[PDB]
């Protein structure tokens, strides 16, 4: 079972909205939100939540740091 | 029929990786992105590619402009 493949998903924001919102972000190029998705990323693996992460600044590019585990 | 509701996913990264691999995953692990992480947030809509922006600091929030829009 360890042997399978399984996909993990960093996922840095899920928000809803209409499909009428978000035809006005998409006619906007930007969706707008205000702060903090950067310390509140989540780790799905195929729908199952994981645990949590932030994104950070490193070594002149990015990288993630897990807040929260499980 | 556009009042509907949907959920609308702004993904960073997928690896595909066993659940033997995972298990090397623990708390306070520090893990490196690309480069080009910023600059290639995928977008999804109830799990369907929809096209790819980028997330930038804005004043007092973040934003993810579109850089690809694939539907209409």
Redesign the interface.
């Known amino acids: ?20 919102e ?2 006005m ?2 006619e906007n ?10 310390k509140h ?1 989540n780790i799905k ?1 195929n729908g199952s939540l994981v ?1 949590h992460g932030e ?2 600044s ?9 807040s ?2 499980m």
């Open positions: 079972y360890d042997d399978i493949n399984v996909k993990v998903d960093f996922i840095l924001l899920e928000k809803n909205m209409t499909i009428n978000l035809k972000y998409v190029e930007l969706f707008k939100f205000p702060d903090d998705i950067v990323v693996v645990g994104l950070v490193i070594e002149d590019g990015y990288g993630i740091e897990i929260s585990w």
